[PDB]
Symmetry: D2
């Protein structure tokens, strides 16, 4: 449900932050 969709949002954000770390 909602909490799973938010969890997926947080994992998407984790990938953005890693991409920012390395750019």
């Amino acid at each position: 449900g909602e909490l799973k969709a938010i969890a997926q949002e947080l994992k998407a954000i984790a990938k953005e932050l890693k991409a920012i770390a390395w750019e």
Copy 2:
């Protein structure tokens, strides 16, 4: 670096939120 450690924090949180969804 910092942003990777924060990304790992967000992935840990995503797993907590999924566990909360299903309990």
Copy 3:
């Protein structure tokens, strides 16, 4: 600008999680 937008998104999620928690509490 990118990190600042992600920061707003996390604050928005925090508010959403408190709304979810409150609704669960209310219902039970």
Copy 4:
């Protein structure tokens, strides 16, 4: 209580990300 603590953690991370962004900006 668990979702409320996670919400505080996300708000804390948001502040940390703005501090990181600002330091990068300052330095450049």
